[PDB]
Amino acid sequence: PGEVCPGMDIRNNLTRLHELENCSVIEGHLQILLMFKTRPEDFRDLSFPKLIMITDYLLLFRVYGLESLKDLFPNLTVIRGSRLFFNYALVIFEMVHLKELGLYNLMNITRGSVRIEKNNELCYLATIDWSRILDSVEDNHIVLNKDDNEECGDICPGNCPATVINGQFVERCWTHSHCQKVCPTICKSHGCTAEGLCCHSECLGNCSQPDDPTKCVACRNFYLDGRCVETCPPPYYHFQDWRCVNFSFCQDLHHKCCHQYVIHNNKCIPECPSGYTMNSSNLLCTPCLGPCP
């Protein structure tokens, strides 16, 4: 991989955006917002191809001069939605100069919905079949964009895959040059190769080779030692609902502290649940004998 980074808030100016330069996974959310003096020229040579996954949500608000995300996040494949912004895993709001999304590698939003609103230049929305990305599209809120108040000339590559929406077959794409990838039904959420060969049952969205859990772009369940696993086996603990960590790691976060991390139900979690207390030294949550101190 690249690097597992914490959740970030990037505002006012682009200088801090270079902090993403080595992340392949954002273990948290990604907020890019309130950049009023930015112009397209400031984004021309700006790219984060390392980014494959965001465990929580992606929020974009009032970023001036940004016209597409095709160059910014070309390989973002999965938004897990472990933690959501107002029940959304993707939020594009008041992005005044955004013309298209262009997240041509986005295959799955594992939990949560989409909110794309008040983006007056935004097209290539009608060309996205969200049913292939989220199970819950009924809760999507996609309104007040260029497509609503004017006639977008959404020209797809021509050629491009075509899917149905209320009896009408429509070609699906992210930009004028990028189609929406669609896999055979049998591949389910696992993804497939260009040739149509299904990825391993433990993959999510895509893989470098078929039927191999060490060749996944992202995991359906848990990640451990470069492999997509179904469960974190003992002595490993499930962490952030996506990876396996050892006792040592979980202990060093507890002592670094933020949250003083604990062990409960084979998970390394921020706090003991209600009715439980932290048994000192072994970090294990044990039930309270009467009320909790």
């Epitope: 433990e202 859990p213 060490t214 848990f222 451990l224 030692d225 470069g226 492999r227 696993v229 179904e230 469960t231 974190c232 086996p233 003992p234 002595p235 490993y236 499930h238 396996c244 050892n246 139900n265 084979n266 998970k267």
Partner: antibody, heavy 118, light 115 residues
């Protein structure tokens, strides 16, 4: 396309140390675990030890005192080393892959017959 | 704590072709993982003069390329391997195993067939 192959002595003098090399193919030793399981003549399978992708080792409590498991990921090999052998250590030694977190030992080696004698 | 002890019953059994067969497995502790509500238990078939073959994992999930006649049952501390209609090719030794914490095999069940 997964293969595991044990290379061992056949014959060991008692009190001497036994050294077996399991050479794996078709998968990365950094993602998979490898076990050592032995089987005395006409007896059942005995789990000896295991080595996780991250290099961590786990040994059979009865034999921990005499066992050593190591590996070379680059050479795709795992090494078992057993000290001060006796006649009851005469068995067929197998190395098997552990897809830990998904399946138990799935692919096994054909074995290595190890005899302790005169 | 104290390492996981595995039992099997019977040690050996002699059955005719086409007969149903059920062999037992006991664990000293629960193999039931809270996280996924699955048991860390395996069944292996070892034919004479061959290395073992995984039949069952997760106490009831049939391994790839395992005939339908092989059925793994149970939860926590008790498990059973069932062969609905024994075939001549089933002559083998069957071993249960924990992979909950480390691995421990039960002393096997030798299944013999009447000619």
């Amino acid at each position: 396309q997964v293969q595991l192959k044990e290379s061992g002595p056949g014959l060991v003098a008692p009190s001497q140390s036994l050294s077996i090399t399991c050479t794996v193919s078709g998968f990365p030793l950094t993602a998979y675990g490898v076990n050592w399981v032995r089987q005395p003549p006409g007896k059942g399978l005995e789990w000896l030890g295991m080595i996780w992708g991250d290099g961590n080792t786990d040994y059979n409590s009865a034999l921990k005192s005499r066992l050593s498991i190591s590996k070379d990921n680059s050479k795709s090999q795992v090494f078992l080393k057993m000290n001060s052998l006796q006649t009851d250590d005469t068995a067929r030694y197998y190395c098997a892959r552990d897809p830990y977190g998904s399946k138990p030992m799935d692919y096994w080696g054909q074995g290595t017959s190890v005899t302790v004698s005169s | 704590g104290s390492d996981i002890v595995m039992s099997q019953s019977p040690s050996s059994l002699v059955v005719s072709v086409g007969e149903k067969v059920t062999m037992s497995c006991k664990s000293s502790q629960s193999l039931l993982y809270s996280s996924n509500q699955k048991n860390f238990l395996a069944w292996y078939q070892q034919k004479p003069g061959q290395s073992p073959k995984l039949l069952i994992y997760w106490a009831s999930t049939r391994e790839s390329g395992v005939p339908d006649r092989f059925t793994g049952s149970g939860s926590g501390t008790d498990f059973t391997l069932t062969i609905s209609s024994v075939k001549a090719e089933d002559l083998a030794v069957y071993y249960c195993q924990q992979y909950f914490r480390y691995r421990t095999f039960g002393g096997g069940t030798k299944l013999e067939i009447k000619s």
